Design a protein around this ligand. Structure first.
Ligand code: G34
Ligand code: K
Ligand code: K
Ligand code: K
Ligand code: K
Ligand code: K
Ligand code: K
Ligand code: K
Ligand code: K
Ligand code: K
Ligand code: K
Ligand code: MG
Ligand code: MG
Ligand code: MG
Ligand code: MG
Ligand code: MG
Ligand code: MG
Ligand code: MG
Ligand code: MG
Ligand code: MG
Ligand code: MG
Ligand code: MG
Ligand code: MG
Ligand code: MG
Ligand code: MG
Ligand code: MG
Ligand code: MG
Ligand code: MG
Ligand code: MG
Ligand code: MG
Ligand code: MG
Ligand code: MG
Ligand code: MG
Ligand code: MG
Ligand code: MG
Ligand code: MG
Ligand code: MG
Ligand code: MG
Ligand code: MG
Ligand code: ZN
Lengths: 208, 172, 38, 142
RNA sequence: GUGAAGAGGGAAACAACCCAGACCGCCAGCUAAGGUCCCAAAGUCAUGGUUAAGUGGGAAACGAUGUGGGAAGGCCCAGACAGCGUCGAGUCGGCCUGCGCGGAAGAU
RNA sequence: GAUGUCGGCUCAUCACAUCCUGGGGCUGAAGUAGGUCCCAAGGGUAUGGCUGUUCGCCAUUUAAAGUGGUACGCGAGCUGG
RNA sequence: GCUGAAAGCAUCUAAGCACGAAACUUGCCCCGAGAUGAGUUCUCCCUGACCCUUUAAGGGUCCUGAAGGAACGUUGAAGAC
């Protein structure tokens, strides 16, 4: 399994031998198990967890009853983690960042920062055409988008301008620099997706 | 045909158990078994082999069926032997249980886990002698061991079948 | 392996064999005689 | 007089269960297609679904002749350029064995709204069990 | 000869090919070419064969113990042919022919 | 009663008769490194000098600097030598 | 390649068995139930009267107005809207 945390921000750890390790600080508060999915009822094995602390007015009656069944406080959302062959968890169990104590590398999933409507230069690394040498109104425009009568259409997946970022991104195989269970902190080497404050899903590295 | 016509003699010791198409041959050296091709008739002394009706091949399938069960009879009775020789400076072999550990001039160990039914011993470092009931399996293991370092055509170095003539040619 | 439209026995030790719908010449004596029709 | 027409709101559709085990794919498919369309009924009407509900069991055990188990290829295009995908019969059986029968029958049913409606009455199962004991399907031998 | 100046049915689609020349109406019948497992009207028709290549459903010289049929030979229980005198039954490769096989690489 | 044209730029997309990388047979294959043929289309596959050039030659790289199809791909996308 | 007949031999193949590549199917990442074949799981909410006519998934009234949603406002490392 993994845990749900919050991107606090970035800093550095100076090592004794004079290396500065860039770190993303992830606040990993206790993940409370809200539901355990099994093969008989649900057709797959997973835990649903919550974290943080939502305010009663913002918790709907459907949400409240789900948390109340688990016997846990409402957190700011629900996330599932698929269970391994061995792994067992109970409803209402709290899972801390101590989970990651012996984990060397993590995959961190977040929602990337939103660039809104992005041109092909930004979105797809298209080359600009001539700034001068006669170019007419076509500096950052995409150029040709197809062939001719054959095929007489634009192909699906054509790289064009559109919404960029504000989407799920996983960065794989980030070194765990420090697990500070007392401060509810995980320090990972390097950048992770999303703005300060955003939800992060941290899992042990799939690749190894 | 001429293979299939010849009935396999049963030695004493080695009981036969036919059923359907699947035959079982059990003796001193284990209990082999085979499902024969559905175009084949076996008839217990002596297992006969001839063609079943409504089957174009027939005598082809009966000749193999014969040859297989001859080897199966001989396998549970006498057993089959294969010897590989190693050739090349610093090429050695040694068996630890059911794993042969071959040094074959690689930058790593080579450890072939011998399959069940096959026993192996190294009379010296440059010889393996496999022993088993299945002629097919012992041939397959021998081929697998040879394939690590096939005999090469200049100096004849590698894992060879002890029988094999390794044709050597000269360098240009 | 010689891949040819015309595959033939080149010596006494050459043998024509059909494997998987492909006419081949295998030779015990001479590896240069190994042929596949193709 | 005017020739009879079946009326969709009054059509009698019966439930059948067929075992695909060891049946030749195409020879089963034609009989399924016939009955899904209702060509076996005197009330057959081209513009009306007069056919029967058919449960097919043991779709994974459907047979093909020749080398078709390895050599029959199912092609589809994803709509994306270069997106021609292929699967052999044996791969289709391993992954999605119901699709073999369903694809065979779909190609033998009329094209258009009614042919799609006819196909909805076919219920293909990989194994020997179905959930439709409430519909009381009669054994149909093909 | 047809199209042009000709509809209808067949050849997926297809002026010029095949069948066939539309005065009008019919919710009758028989046929033509072409067809009769499902799309899709009609044989999952009958009898005897061939093919195993999805050949059928693209492609030549040429290559090959694929496989079927026919005629005729050589050698052979004075032991042939293959394997190692032994061994006990056929063997050998030309001919003609049917159907297949390789030869066979292209762009949404 | 108009189907805009060479070359460049931008953006491509497919084929495989494969340039590199992968697998393999033969070699007049000791090794290294080649030659040749077979399989393989996943990905990758120079920058400059000269010239409108494509190309080519030249300089210097690169694992490699593939060959073709796409209205000799692409001017209601740019350029206009 | 193994075993192995047809074809007493031989033969990787006909039966059977084993290897074998960046191609293929997965494994990795993202989308994804309009997957109309519209799936699953958990939780939450509403437990009134009444009369017609075309007695039917018929129609209307009186009362009721839930969960939740939307709207509005303050807004955002979300955003052309
Ligand atoms: C005017 C026609 C043009 C624009 C250009 C034409 O090129 C020529 O005709 C060459 S002669 C040349 C054309 C124009 C007009 C006068 C003068 C002479 N110039 C400036 C050219 C390249 C073809 C050879 C003939 C067909 C064309 C369509 C497709 C094509 O490639 C064109 C015509 C239909 C097109 O409209
Ligand atoms: K006429
Ligand atoms: K075909
Ligand atoms: K190109
Ligand atoms: K080579
Ligand atoms: K490639
Ligand atoms: K043109
Ligand atoms: K131009
Ligand atoms: K245009
Ligand atoms: K323009
Ligand atoms: K749904
Ligand atoms: Mg933004
Ligand atoms: Mg540029
Ligand atoms: Mg201007
Ligand atoms: Mg400008
Ligand atoms: Mg089109
Ligand atoms: Mg093969
Ligand atoms: Mg139609
Ligand atoms: Mg005229
Ligand atoms: Mg006409
Ligand atoms: Mg016509
Ligand atoms: Mg027509
Ligand atoms: Mg008639
Ligand atoms: Mg019909
Ligand atoms: Mg019949
Ligand atoms: Mg064909
Ligand atoms: Mg041919
Ligand atoms: Mg015009
Ligand atoms: Mg090729
Ligand atoms: Mg591909
Ligand atoms: Mg792959
Ligand atoms: Mg240049
Ligand atoms: Mg052009
Ligand atoms: Mg081009
Ligand atoms: Mg312009
Ligand atoms: Mg244009
Ligand atoms: Mg000019
Ligand atoms: Mg043999
Ligand atoms: Mg690589
Ligand atoms: Zn030879």
């Amino acid at each position: 399994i993994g845990l749900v945390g919050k991107k606090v921000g970035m800093t550095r750890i100076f090592t004794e031998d004079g290396v500065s390790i860039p770190v993303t600080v992830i606040e990993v508060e206790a993940n409370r198990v809200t539901q355990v999915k099994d093969l008989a009822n649900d057709g797959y094995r997973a835990i649903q967890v919550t974290t943080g602390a939502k305010k009663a007015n913002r918790v709907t009656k459907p949400e409240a009853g789900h948390f109340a069944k688990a016997g846990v406080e409402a957190g700011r959302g629900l996330w599932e983690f698929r269970l391994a062959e061995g792994e067992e968890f109970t409803v209402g169990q709290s899972i801390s960042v101590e989970l990651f104590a012996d984990v060397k590398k993590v995959d961190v999933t977040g929602t990337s920062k939103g660039k809104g409507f992005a041109g092909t230069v930004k979105r797809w690394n298209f080359r600009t055409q001539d700034a001068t040498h006669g170019n007419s109104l076509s500096h950052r425009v995409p150029g040709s988008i197809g062939q001719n009568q054959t095929p007489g259409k634009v192909f699906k997946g054509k790289k064009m301008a559109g919404q960029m970022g504000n989407e799920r991104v996983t960065v794989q195989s980030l070194d765990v620099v420090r697990v500070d269970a007392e401060r509810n902190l995980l320090l990972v080497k390097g950048a992770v997706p999303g703005a300060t404050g955003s939800d992060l899903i941290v899992k042990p590295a799939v690749k190894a | 045909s001429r293979v299939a016509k010849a009935p396999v003699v049963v030695p004493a010791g080695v009981d036969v158990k036919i059923n359907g198409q699947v035959i079982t041959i059990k003796g001193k050296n284990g209990e082999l078994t085979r499902t024969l091709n559905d175009a084949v008739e076996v008839k217990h002394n002596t297992l006969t082999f001839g063609p079943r009706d409504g089957y174009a091949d027939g005598w082809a399938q009966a000749g193999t069926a014969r040859a297989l069960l001859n080897s199966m009879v001989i396998g549970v009775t006498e057993g089959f032997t294969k010897k590989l020789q190693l050739v090349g400076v610093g090429y050695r072999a040694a068996v630890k249980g059911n794993v042969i550990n071959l040094s074959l001039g690689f930058s790593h160990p080579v450890d072939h886990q011998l399959p069940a039914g096959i026993t192996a011993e190294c009379p010296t470092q440059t010889e393996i002698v496999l022993k088993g009931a299945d002629k097919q399996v012992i041939g397959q293991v021998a081929a697998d061991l040879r394939a690590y370092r096939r005999p090469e055509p200049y100096k004849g170095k590698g894992v060879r079948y002890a029988d094999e003539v390794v044709r050597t040619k000269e360098a240009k | 392996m010689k891949v040819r439209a015309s595959v033939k026995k080149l010596c006494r030790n050459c043998k024509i064999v059909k494997r998987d719908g492909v006419i081949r010449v295998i030779c015990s004596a001479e590896p240069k005689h190994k042929q596949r029709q193709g | 007089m005017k020739t009879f027409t079946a009326k969709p709101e009054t059509v009698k559709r019966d439930w059948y269960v067929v075992d695909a085990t060891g049946k030749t794919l195409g020879r089963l498919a034609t009989e399924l297609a016939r009955r899904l369309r209702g060509k076996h009924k005197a009330e057959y009407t081209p513009h009306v679904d007069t056919g029967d509900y058919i449960i097919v069991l043991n779709a994974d055990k459907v047979a093909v002749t020749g080398n078709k188990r390895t050599d029959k290829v199912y092609y589809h295009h994803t709509g994306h350029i270069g997106g021609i995908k292929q699967a052999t019969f044996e791969e289709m059986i391993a992954r999605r064995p119901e699709r073999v029968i369903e694809i065979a029958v779909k190609g033998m049913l009329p094209k258009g709204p009614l042919g799609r409606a006819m196909f909805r009455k076919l219920k293909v199962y990989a194994g020997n069990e179905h959930n439709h004991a409430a519909q009381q399907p009669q054994v149909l031998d093909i």
